[PDB]
């Protein structure tokens, strides 16, 4: 037979982390 | 025979850490 | 025949860090 195919391309980068909640009162 | 096809795309990475609290009004 | 498929690609990088929140009222 033949040798195996090359490694696949790297994956999508993870989702960005959420923003923090609302600040203290004006 | 010829070599196999290229491997599937990698998994998506972990989500980033959450941000800190918003400044004051 | 052909060889098998190569391993899956490397996993994506951890997501970017979360940002500062909205201002209060």
């Amino acid at each position, epitope marked *: 037979p033949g040798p195996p195919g090359p490694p696949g391309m790297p994956g999508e980068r*993870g989702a960005a982390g*959420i923003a*923090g*909640p609302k600040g203290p009162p004006g | 025979g010829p070599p196999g096809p290229p491997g599937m795309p990698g*998994e998506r*990475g*972990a*989500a*980033g*850490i*959450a*941000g*800190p*609290k918003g400044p004051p009004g | 025949p052909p060889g098998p498929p190569g391993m899956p690609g*490397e*996993r*994506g*990088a*951890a997501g*970017i*860090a*979360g940002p500062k929140g909205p201002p209060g009222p």
Partner: antibody
């Protein structure tokens, strides 16, 4: 399986530096933000900071910003932490723990003791 | 930061009975649809072990005996039924606002 091989325990004279290790294994190192926690026995768990290793980027709790200096080596699949100007309060037990929305996998913890 | 507060301090129950622990948060920790509280177990000389994430969901490999419910700012952890394995410290923490913060602890002792 996923494993977080932490470095050996440590004793240091106050005012000295200290560097710590957390060899990661069994998952892509890059893909998960790694964090550090501090436990002082009989008191709660205090989040120190976290470092994404794919870039070296880091985020610290306000408290530990002057103390703690997080590093990572992509070849080694190792995360490091450095604590400087040690002062007794620093003496405690330090965990590195992997984060994927929550702290699913932890190391065993390096243990620091600071005294004359 | 966000301040999480656990109750009670320590509690004693007999094997087979039910044990309930409550985590209370200074500000509620909900992002859009769902709350972001996790429950951890920790035993002497050992790192913490994840039990519950997002309050309702259970980490794969954790026995059903561990049911956790909450919503909003107030959460609780429940075990039915208690077992000799389950002697531990139990912690609540949130992944909603950095810096991430943990509970104060709740010791679980057996009644005998």
């Amino acid at each position: 399986q996923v494993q977080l091989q932490q470095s050996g325990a440590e004793l240091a004279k106050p005012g000295t530096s200290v560097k710590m290790s957390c060899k990661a294994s069994g998952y892509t190192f890059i893909s998960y933000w790694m964090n550090w926690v501090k436990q002082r026995p009989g008191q709660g768990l205090e989040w120190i900071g976290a470092i994404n290793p794919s870039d070296g980027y880091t985020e610290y709790n306000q408290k530990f910003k002057d103390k703690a200096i997080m590093t990572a080596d992509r070849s080694s699949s190792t995360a490091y932490m450095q604590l400087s100007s040690l002062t007794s309060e620093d003496s405690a037990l330090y965990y590195c723990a992997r984060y994927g929305g929550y702290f699913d996998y932890w190391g065993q913890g390096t243990t620091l003791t600071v005294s004359s | 930061d966000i301040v999480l507060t656990q109750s009670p301090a320590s509690l004693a129950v007999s094997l087979g009975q039910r044990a309930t622990i409550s985590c209370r948060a200074s500000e509620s920790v909900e992002y859009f649809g769902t709350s972001l509280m996790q429950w951890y177990q920790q035993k002497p000389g050992q790192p913490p072990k994840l039990l519950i994430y997002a309050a309702s969901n259970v980490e794969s490999g954790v026995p059903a005996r561990f049911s956790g419910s909450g919503s909003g700012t107030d959460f609780s952890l429940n075990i039915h039924p208690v077992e000799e394995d389950d002697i531990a410290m139990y912690f609540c923490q949130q992944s909603r606002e950095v810096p991430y913060t943990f509970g104060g602890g709740s010791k679980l002792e057996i009644k005998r």
